[PDB]
């Protein structure tokens, strides 16, 4: 497992749930077994998580309305059956509609919350509509002082683990007193909760050196 896959919850990484480290060691033999994805500014996400030094995850119910939750795929197989990143919730249509999605998560706690979310890029327009109804999806994740709007883009990408489609991963940090707001007319890969952020001596290293006592 790479640190990011452990973060996201790729099934073969599920051992790493809620783990802690001073030093996370990434091996060269690591590989991704789940829905093919990418992280814009991968380096930064990797850094800030490595530095936080904990994967501790705290669940939160978001009030989603009139959409199916827990979408999954055969590209990401958990056990015998189809699956998906454990920390992400794939939302899609209920029947003939994907109601615009507008939700809030205040941070009333003592520390910072790290939210990992995503946008789905379908391969064909058919795939877009079969999932989200509307031909053009969109996701805006915001706080009081900052915002991100991602527009998903339909098109083909190299075949990977079965799919020509992709997921783009994004993150939002919410300080205490701030509020998270998620707004989507579809294509949203929703967070299931937050990762606790810590400061300290933690970091990450790439090495093939055996660990020893």
């Amino acid at each position, epitope marked *: 497992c790479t640190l990011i896959d452990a973060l996201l919850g790729d099934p073969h990484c599920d051992g790493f749930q809620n783990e802690k480290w001073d030093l996370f060691v990434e091996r060269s033999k690591a590989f991704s077994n789940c829905y093919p994805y990418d992280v814009p500014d991968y380096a930064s996400l990797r850094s800030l998580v490595a530095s936080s030094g904990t994967l501790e995850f705290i669940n939160e119910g978001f009030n989603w309305t009139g959409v199916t939750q827990n979408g999954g795929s055969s590209a990401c197989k958990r056990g015998p059956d189809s699956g998906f990143f454990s920390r992400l919730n794939w939302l899609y249509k209920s*029947g003939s509609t994907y109601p615009v999605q507008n939700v809030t998560m205040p941070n009333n706690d003592n520390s910072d919350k790290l939210y990992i979310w995503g946008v789905h890029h379908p391969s064909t327009d058919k795939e877009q509509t079969n*999932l989200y109804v509307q031909a053009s999806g969109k996701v805006t994740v915001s706080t009081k002082r900052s915002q991100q709007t991602i527009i998903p883009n339909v098109g083909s990408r190299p075949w990977v683990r079965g799919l020509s489609s992709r997921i783009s991963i994004y993150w939002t940090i919410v300080k205490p007193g701030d509020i998270l707001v998620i707004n989507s007319n579809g294509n949203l890969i929703a967070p299931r909760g937050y990762f606790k952020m810590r400061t300290g001596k933690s970091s990450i290293m790439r090495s093939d050196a055996p660990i020893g006592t």
Partner: antibody
Amino acid sequence: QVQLQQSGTELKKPGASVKISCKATGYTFSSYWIEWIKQRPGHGLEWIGEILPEIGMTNYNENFKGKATFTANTSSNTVYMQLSSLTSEDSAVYYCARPYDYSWFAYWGQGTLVTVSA
Amino acid sequence: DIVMTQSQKFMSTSVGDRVSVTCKASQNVDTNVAWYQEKPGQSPKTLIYSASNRYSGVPDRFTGSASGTDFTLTITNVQSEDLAEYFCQQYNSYPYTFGGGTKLEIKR
């Protein structure tokens, strides 16, 4: 012309399992959900669930969770439904259907009869 | 779940006459409702969608209507080939639900 070809009739002892196939022809296979519907002689029409073939996303009726499992072979353009732990309650005619595009049903299969008894 | 109630298990009509099947959703489905015709021994066939709309190849005799949660399939000039069972479906939200079915019966 769009055609959904289901598999032959089936007879199965209680407690066994069965895999019914739906073979889609005459349209791009990956562009449409495949739906499964159950019909018992006194219960009318129950919706089992749907599967979107490319990405293998399965959506089940809460009532069938654990009874029914959809899969898709994208090379053979075929959708399979598997029924497990069969009881007499599962004796019915099973249809597979394709939406016009994303919602209401346009094309139906010819049906597969499944009978369960010792 | 949403219940689609077709209260008429059997309808009586005569050829050339007019007949209406009712279906009542138990909560708002908007206008997303379809009507299907199942003849004996054949597979279901599609009649109506969006509650008012004629699917291609369907005779002008069949017309759907909707008022609120009330949906009605009306056949004018019933023919003999119209002997069948009629199902309504709400495709509005999951799970998709169906009506009990209404068997059309003829008097000659």
